[PDB]
Amino acid sequence: RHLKSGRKLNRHSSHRLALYRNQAKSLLTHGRITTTVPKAKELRGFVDHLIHLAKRGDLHARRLVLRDLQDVKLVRKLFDEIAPRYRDRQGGYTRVLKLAERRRGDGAPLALVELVE
Amino acid sequence: MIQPQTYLEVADNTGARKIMCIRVLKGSNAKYATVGDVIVASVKEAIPRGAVKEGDVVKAVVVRTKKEVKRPDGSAIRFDDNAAVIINNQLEPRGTRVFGPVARELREKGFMKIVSLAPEVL
């Protein structure tokens, strides 16, 4: 069992992928989103790559990302509306930033992360 | 690759190309009827006539499955598990034998006769 560990994840894989997706999506919707510390760390890694194909561009890159988030509206909104703007940059198309505040009863430290303008 | 209580083919005069070995002869602490080794046992399978019977001898390890890493890093794994029955002196008991070349055996060496004996496309 455990030692040298790569890609830090919680819940259960099906859930995880579930989240990564949903949030990846909601964000693509709002540019900037609010969640808990790692929610962000990772959502960063994933939405990072995702927008990377968004830009990647073409019938394929597209087909892939839809394979993923299942919805044209966005599909496109993304792939052709912002993706480009980024497309020339260099990965890390996102900004993960911690806030000074915790969710209730728990103290969960959270923050916001968004398409990186 | 190894075993104690075991079921393995042979092919010599073998009244049954199979027996069951208690243990590896070597240094008291067998634990692995090792390739190219030798062991203790009884027959499990039937011998029409034969002369072999349903007794027990001493024999040498041929084939095996799971890791024949020869010294020079030459390698092979047999998809069968057998030995040649030895009759205690070591010297083998039979006419022929079904199996091919591949030193590991000869590396043991003593049984060259085996060596010569079984040697082809079978």
């Binding site: 900037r32 930033l97 911690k98 806030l99 000074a100 505040e101 923050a111 | -």
Partner: protein
């Protein structure tokens, strides 16, 4: 099954809750306005270091 015996009493509850102890929050001046904040997070005023995008509505 395994109930202790009685308590070094004070001695105990103490020694223990003691090494326990409780501290306060590490903090510094705002990367912009007033008060302070933690090692890296905007806040309901000087909402930034480069683009607040946060403080009041």
């Amino acid at each position: 099954h395994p109930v202790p015996k009685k308590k070094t009493s004070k001695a105990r509850r103490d020694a223990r809750r003691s090494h326990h102890a409780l501290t306060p929050p590490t903090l510094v001046p705002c990367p912009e306005c007033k008060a302070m904040k933690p090692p890296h997070t905007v806040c309901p005023e000087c909402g930034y270091y480069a683009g607040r995008k946060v403080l009041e509505v």
